Structure 1
Amino acid sequence: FSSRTPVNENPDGVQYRRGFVTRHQVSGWRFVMRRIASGVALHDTRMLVDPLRTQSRAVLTGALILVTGLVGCFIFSLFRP
């Protein structure tokens, strides 16, 4: 339900400096960064499909396959005689 943040009308109140980074903020930053990257490498900003994110995901999936096979053969060496 409630989501708001009215304007503070008190001059003697508290002002919240030194903000952190929210999950929302970091997601928005990652999005705008992927959008700039798309607009630079390609000439798309409509972002209907992002092949760059797919490529990065592909390389990281390769890395995950790597580390998974590694730990798998490791525990295989240990458990088996």
Structure 2
Amino acid sequence: DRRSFSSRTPVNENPDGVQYRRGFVTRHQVSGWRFVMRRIASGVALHDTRMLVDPLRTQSRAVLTGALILVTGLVGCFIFS
């Protein structure tokens, strides 16, 4: 097809193979953390962790949507004046 190059990483066996000390959370790490904490937090309220349907995040995103529509109407009537 387009001949893609799946991410790879070998070894080093030399001097520059243990010098970096760069702490920077990549997108994957923050996604993984979100998911792990939403599979634990759904293991002490639902008592099953097959994670097929999560209602907790549903509740939280519902209250968030309430907040966002709140601020939207706030400014959309602030423009009214």
TM-score, structure 2 as length reference? 0.84
Query: 1:6 offset after TM fit, Å?
Result: 1.1
Cα deviation digits, residues 22-68 of structure 1 (max 9, x gap): 11100100000000100111112111011011001100000011000
Query: 1:2 offset after TM fit, Å?
Result: 3.6
Q: Which moved more, 1:13-22 or 1:31-40?
A: 13-22
Query: 1:11 offset after TM fit, Å?
Result: 4.0
Equivalents in 2 of 1:66, 1:47: separation in Å? 31
Question: RMSD of the TM alignment (CA)?
Answer: 1.4
Extract unaligned runs of 5+ from structure 2.
Answer: none
Equivalents in 2 of 1:46, 1:7: separation in Å? 36
Equivalent of 1:8 in 6, 12, 24: 12
Count residues with an aligned counterpart. 77
Equivalents in 1 of 2:13, 2:46: separation in Å? 46
Extract unaligned runs of 5+ from structure 1.
Answer: none
TM-score, structure 1 as length reference? 0.84
Q: Quick check: which one's helix share is greater? A: 1
Identity level (%):
100
Q: Which moved more, 1:53-62 or 1:6-15?
A: 6-15
